[PDB]
Amino acid sequence: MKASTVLQIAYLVSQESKCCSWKVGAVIEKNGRIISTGYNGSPAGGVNCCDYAAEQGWLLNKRFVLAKEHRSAHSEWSSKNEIHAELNAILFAAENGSSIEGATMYVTLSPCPDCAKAIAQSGIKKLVYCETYDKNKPGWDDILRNAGIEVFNVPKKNLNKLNWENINEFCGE
């Protein structure tokens, strides 16, 4: 399917995320059909990010945003509690038994180093993203290209089938 189409599907998927910092969505497409999806969040039996941020007082009203002064505390907690969108999409394929070899991954946000190295080793041959992650540095995609993975970008401006008024991505103050 068209890149703009799947990317926007990844954006709808991201809305299911309970993370108070960023809402990320990932879609795995094989031969034109979606065979897996994922969004960033905690595992089973684990408290959701938004609920934990509430208890910790990391949020600020108007509709809650993660306070800049607490983003650091969120990153530390998230690193060891929230599975990223890309990995969740891949994890479901392993758990369900769906081969993603040769597939294409669409993700709302450019993958962090942990996700990039996993993607490079997953069998995925193409990665398409929209926004560039907050904490990413230049050349972050080298590991993907060296693995033989094509990396493409589609700007938000080409995505006009979504009512952006109701799509939340970055949720920090």
Ligand X SMILES: O=C1N[C@H](O)C=CN1[C@H]1C[C@H](O)[C@@H](COP(=O)(O)O)O1
Q: Looking at the annotation, which residues are catalytic?
A: 86
Q: Which does 8 bind (CB under 5 to 8 A by kind): Zn ion, a copy of itself, ligand X, none?
A: a copy of itself
Residue from 9, 84, 89, 141 touching ligand X (CB under 6 A): that is 84
Residue 144's SS3 state is helix
84 and 40 Cβ atoms separated by less than 8 Å? yes
Restricting to residues 94-123, which ones interact with a copy of itself according to CB under 8 A? 96, 98
Report the residue numbers after which the chain has a gap, meaning the C atom sits over 2.5 angstroms from the next written residue's N, or none.
62
Q: How many alpha carbons lie under 13 Å from residue 19 in its C-beta half-sphere?
A: 29
Decide whether 71 or 125 has the Cβ nearer to a copy of itself.
Answer: 125
71 binds ligand X (CB under 6 A): yes
> Do the annotations mark residue 115 as ligand-binding?
yes
Lay out the site mask for a copy of itself across 64-93 (x = CB under 8 A, - = otherwise).
Answer: -------------------------x--x-
> Do the annotations mark residue 130 as ligand-binding?
no
Lay out the site mask for a copy of itself across 24-53 (x = CB under 8 A, - = otherwise).
Answer: ---x--xx-xxxxxx---------------
Contacts of 160 (CB under 8 A, 6+ apart): none
Please give the DSSP secondary-structure letter assigned to residue 18. -
> Do the annotations mark residue 74 as ligand-binding?
yes
From residue 81, how far is each of 45, 60, 131, 146 by CA, in Å? 11, 22, 23, 30
